[PDB]
Design a protein around this ligand. Structure first.
Ligand SMILES: Nc1ncnc2c1ncn2[C@@H]1O[C@H](COP(=O)(O)OP(=O)(O)OP(=O)(O)O)[C@@H](O)[C@H]1O
Ligand SMILES: Nc1ncnc2c1ncn2[C@@H]1O[C@H](COP(=O)(O)OP(=O)(O)OP(=O)(O)O)[C@@H](O)[C@H]1O
Ligand SMILES: Nc1ncnc2c1ncn2[C@@H]1O[C@H](COP(=O)(O)OP(=O)(O)OP(=O)(O)O)[C@@H](O)[C@H]1O
Ligand SMILES: [K+]
Ligand SMILES: [K+]
Ligand SMILES: [K+]
Ligand SMILES: [Mg+2]
Ligand SMILES: [Mg+2]
Ligand SMILES: [Mg+2]
Lengths: 523, 523, 523
């Protein structure tokens, strides 16, 4: 339609106003003294959340240019959540700081593309320095502390994540689920996990988490590809009568003749989903057989000659809970048979003892790790649904933070790591003066997380920032106890991946936004 | 769409205004001198109710932030009703008191997260002190008094509930249904009850009670699920000939080829429902056989070879009334042969006389308890429909309260138990000063139920609260007779579960609500 | 008419909003890095001013409660201007800080009357500590530095004021008036000054400074008070034909038959003013004789028999410029006769050498000091009228500040003195806790001038405030050079009277305002 076109400082201040609205709503949640945000939901009760990305996703403005800025900066929280699942508030705070300082430099007549280049150079240097001063979470062994910090100083959540990592392994699969009591529970049970996603965007359930849940579902397995509808239509009727939702693990499924027909068949009463099969050839068949044995099902094949028309409900597999996400799909609890599971584990161990191929060896080691470790389910204890959603979000944040910590390491929390890397980059220079000003903009924005943490505590951010900058190493400000000390010793640890990702995404988006002179939107 | 975003005290006062609107409407109903609320119904006559959750569910505000506050608080009454079925007004009163005091503390600069932690610590301590203060309802033997208090001092309702618990046992199943006369009736008849729910969210009938009623229905039983629904299609038409609702008890039934098709088939004249069967394997088959014998029906099986195509209406089961709820589904009066029921009971008793396995022992004991106890139906007597709805709500409250009393115990009513536990927690302290303020907020809110009860009587709540606090034990204030005395002696008994649940849910929601600094809603 | 009535926090936030509007407009002008405010004038060009009281007087809000707050704080700048003629921005900043912190304490449930009592106790203690901390400007001898600081670091203005004080004495009268060139001129000329005001409030000219000006005026002197109007009507006609404005000096004149008649006679072409004469009886006659000899005029008396009807234009006195103010009326330049002036001075000196009465001695010494010192005139040099008004305001501020400095002493500038006295009052306590919180409010608000000075420089106020508080003595922050050092050594000196008065007026008004629970205005 007809477009409103704005130029220069008018467009820039409107975009900054939108960025500020989103970033203020998100930044009120930063740190231990960060507060909560109520998001009105079109379905049911409002959501109370301390998660930056949840607040960011819900922000949309009446003013179109302000909304444009809000959406562009909301991309920062979205990317931070997608990458690290944590630090979305920090990423938003950093993006707002870079935007504000860069727009100030633009108003000083400097070339915004050179400012963007300086910001990018500073952020590359800072990512290198973050890697340099990162400390492995195996050496530090503070997975509980990382989980506690990421769960808003909830020591019980961090202890639970630490116990789950001690039980199913630091790389084992852990899933956060809604509990039934008022207490958080940890249950290590038998399950399977494969890194595959749903093949239909309309499969998403009523919750907007992006992943679908199947309660006591029906597992279907097939290594070959079927053509005719009427061949497996009686199987569709049998599934429709089993009472348990259908999850199909096949090589690949379209939506032209299967998803469209079923979506025109239902109004949404039963959630039927299909997933891809990791690997190919012999590996796909062997993983399918393992999944069938875990769930008590069977896998059809051309060589076997078994047809789906003769398949019964008892022949097919059954589970208790399945979580299907784009990144990773996990069958949480498949009944199957414990003796069968143990026998399959022993058989795969014997196969390891037999085979010698390097790729086969590593895939068999992955298989035995998946089977022996099982899954660990953390049931969130909460008296109400709003408390359940809040605590589950915090536990998922702690889970993501602990995974990122054991993957990439830890650094001093409370914004201290960014302060230290900015201090180490004081002598960084660019090609020209505008690049140097962009570098200074990035370095000053690197203090914004600590300053916002301190602002949320009601203290004076400049004094605390100066005291931290005057220190060295992991010296910083415990905002919970409102006192200075060694951040590592006090247990305030941030995953290096979370900090690095927040900085990188904030920098990319914000540096792009400071280079804008014109904005085109609808009237 | 575009979002209105509010921050700090403006958001908090709008949230509190919504909370106050909902809580005032709910709280006018508290205590013996509490009054009624008329809720306008889009269908039929308005509903007159003294039930806090009924008033709460009907509250929705034009202002969006006030509406958010109202919805969050309405969650308290919803959770209290779901858990204890009583005390929703007390839960709302407690939530409003916690929110008001906690928002006052937040306005005093206190960190709301620490206030929430202090509130949670105080509420955990008070739950412990309520458990300690609780007295078993078997020892006290005041089920009639509990039912009388929960029925708004209706001694006839309490006496009826006491007689029903004396006849079918304290754990026997009791259903409240509309009568035909102007007097309340108690009828102990043969029936069955299994803890299973409906498999379709659209199965809810015209009444919004959440449980569906089938009048003189037709019972269908099956332990195995056939593939295609066209096989029983003749049985479906045979059912469609006889105007009896079809309740199908099976292992599990989906809805994407049976419920969706039946929804597209009929417009809702006569209803058909499907439910799960308790147990699995042999236990499920035994339960289905028992239900069929109670209702005079038959159970199909693969081993038997009896196909549904040969099934007739006479072979299938039949009942007089069935109430299907998510928590528990009960067949009130299955139309079956009395001699057959007695013979089945004798055969089962012989099975106890033969069986010895501990799990089999307990399941057989449950079977004989369910069969011998039967069901007790309370026919609510009322001249008009509005009086019927009001009295039925009160009798359901009394039933829930008596169940909670025989389950978890009783305490002094009139808010005296919360006053006593708050007095016992005067020396409770948290980690810091804000946590201590949160504890004091929780303790002061624990007085709110008694104060609101006294306000509804027109007396001065502070004087009565001080007089009660100056006493000890079960000393409190009979608001019906407007005089002080031992609450247990005067029969003002509250179930411990009801009090504890009201406190826990009010605390969870209100503590989360005082921690909000930003609110995002539609414009 | 009909009244809008607001209560509690709604009234308080409206009042605070008005206070904030006025104080923000005023506070943008504080310190060496303070900027200017453009005030729209209904007559002619807008005025550009760095004066806090000029901005404050021009502020009036559409909202009535915000306007009430604005008027109440505008009283602070008005009182500071009336008392010290300087520090009105500091007084406004202090008042805003006291109001903000005190309203925060009121929102914390604290008694505002006790907060006001604590504020008053802290401010009394701080006035005492300022008196102790003050250093005489005779010992320091930094009148040039005081004038430079008060003229917004205009060293030329401070040097000019210092030269004028060296010439006509520190107590000699100095008048700032518009020049004709682009350079500031200092002219020590013969004149007189008596601490008397105009007898009519309608005499105020179009300029709003409150002091009327007569260009080349005609001086009339009289000691005896005649009754009728026709007696001096020939004198009035002689003045009307003379062409020079009339300034009458007498005992006392009403306005029933003279001011009203002269107001109705003309429309405002040439102004005619009447003023009191210093002293009484013989002293009044001697003062009138001295003034007449200075201006070349004559004084009528009953004993002399010289009637006003016989007075001629040559007999009456004449001057070149007259400025009349309520506080003090000064005849700037009267022609008279130099030989007559010298003869009168010698005669009065001989009278001193003759008489011996202590009161006569002191009055004669005052007379000879006034005659010998004469007057100093500072001609403000500016190319345009807007620059003229701005520079004249700054020179008048410097003049007032130098007078206050030689009267009451100096302290460290840049808000350092208030910081030091707040540090000294750290252990001050009141009767109760609310009084102690009021004391803390006053002590925190006494940091506001330095913090606003630093904010106007674009630096971080908390860091500079902490650095200054960590220092001792006159150590502070030169905001012009942006570096720390001894405030006295760098010549940043504030008159002790200016600082003390700003604190006292801010405290009185702000403490009264924090005690308000209801506001009544027009709708
Ligand atoms: N006690 C503490 N003292 C100081 N800083 C702390 C403390 N606890 C946590 N932090 C810091 O607060 C930040 C985490 O706050 P928060 O979890 O609200 O934001 P986030 O991780 O950036 O985003 P998200 O909302 O996506 O989780 C990290 O920088 C962490 O190191
Ligand atoms: N005669 C009485 N004297 C004093 N308190 C009484 C008396 N009768 C009942 N109460 C008290 O009144 C409260 C019950 O009020 P009411 O039943 O209206 O609300 P509720 O139990 O909170 O919730 P709901 O609306 O769901 O029933 C309990 O605290 C009970 O102990
Ligand atoms: N170079 C300087 N460094 C630090 N502080 C300074 C400097 N020059 C002046 N100041 C301080 O700035 C303040 C004067 O500011 P300003 O004159 O604008 O306001 P004011 O005196 O409060 O009122 P008004 O507007 O009526 O003159 C004093 O506290 C003075 O000591
Ligand atoms: K956050
Ligand atoms: K009620
Ligand atoms: K000023
Ligand atoms: Mg986090
Ligand atoms: Mg009740
Ligand atoms: Mg000044």
């Amino acid at each position: 339609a007809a477009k409103d076109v704005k130029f220069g400082n008018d467009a820039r201040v409107k975009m900054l106003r939108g960025v500020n609205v989103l970033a203020d709503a998100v930044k009120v949640t930063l740190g231990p003294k960060g507060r909560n945000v109520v998001l009105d939901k079109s379905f049911g009760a409002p959501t109370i959340t301390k998660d930056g990305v949840s607040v960011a996703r819900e922000i949309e403005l009446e003013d179109k240019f302000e909304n444009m800025g809000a959406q562009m900066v909301k991309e920062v929280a979205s990317k931070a959540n997608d990458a690290a699942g944590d630090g979305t508030t920090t990423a938003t705070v950093l993006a707002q700081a870079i935007i504000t300082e860069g727009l100030k430099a633009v108003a000083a007549g400097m070339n915004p593309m050179d400012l963007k280049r300086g910001i990018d150079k500073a952020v590359t240097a800072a990512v290198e320095e973050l890697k340099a001063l990162s400390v492995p979470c195996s050496d530090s062994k503070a997975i509980a502390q990382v989980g506690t910090i990421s769960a808003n100083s909830d020591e019980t959540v961090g202890k639970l994540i630490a116990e789950a990592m001690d039980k199913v392994g630091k790389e084992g699969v852990i899933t956060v689920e809604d509990g039934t009591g008022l207490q958080d529970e940890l249950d290590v049970v038998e399950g399977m996990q494969f890194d595959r996603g749903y093949l239909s965007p309309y499969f998403i359930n009523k919750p907007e988490t992006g992943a679908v849940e199947l309660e006591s579902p029906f597992i279907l397995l097939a290594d070959k590809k079927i053509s005719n509808i009427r061949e497996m239509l009686p199987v569709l009727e049998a599934v429709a009568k089993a009472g348990k939702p259908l999850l199909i693990i096949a090589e690949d499924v379209e939506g032209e003749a299967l998803a469209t027909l079923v979506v025109n068949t239902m109004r949404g009463i039963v959630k039927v989903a299909a997933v891809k099969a990791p690997g190919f050839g012999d590996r796909r068949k062997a993983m399918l057989q393992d999944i069938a044995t875990l769930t008590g099902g069977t896998v059809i094949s051309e060589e076997i000659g078994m047809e789906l028309e003769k398949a019964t409900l008892e022949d097919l597999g059954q589970a208790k809970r399945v979580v299907i996400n784009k990144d990773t799909t996990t069958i949480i609890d498949g009944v199957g048979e414990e003796a069968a599971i143990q026998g399959r584990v022993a058989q795969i161990r014997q196969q390891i003892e037999e085979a010698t191929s390097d790729y086969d060896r590593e895939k068999l080691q992955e298989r035995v790790a998946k089977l022996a470790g099982g899954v660990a389910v953390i049931k969130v204890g909460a008296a109400t649904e709003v408390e359940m959603k809040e605590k589950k979000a915090r536990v998922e944040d702690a889970l993501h933070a602990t995974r990122a910590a054991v993957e990439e390491g830890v650094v001093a929390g409370g914004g201290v790591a960014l302060i230290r890397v900015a201090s180490k980059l004081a002598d960084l220079r660019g090609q020209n003066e505008d690049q140097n000003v962009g570098i200074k903009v990035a370095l000053r924005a690197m203090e914004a997380p600590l300053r916002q943490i301190v602002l949320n505590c009601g203290e004076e951010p400049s004094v605390v920032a100066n005291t931290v900058k005057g220190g060295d190493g992991n010296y910083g400000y415990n905002a919970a106890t409102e006192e200075y000390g060694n951040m590592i010793d006090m247990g305030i640890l941030d995953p290096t991946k979370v900090t690095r990702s927040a900085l990188q995404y904030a920098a990319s988006v914000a540096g792009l936004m400071i280079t804008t002179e014109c904005m085109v939107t609808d009237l």
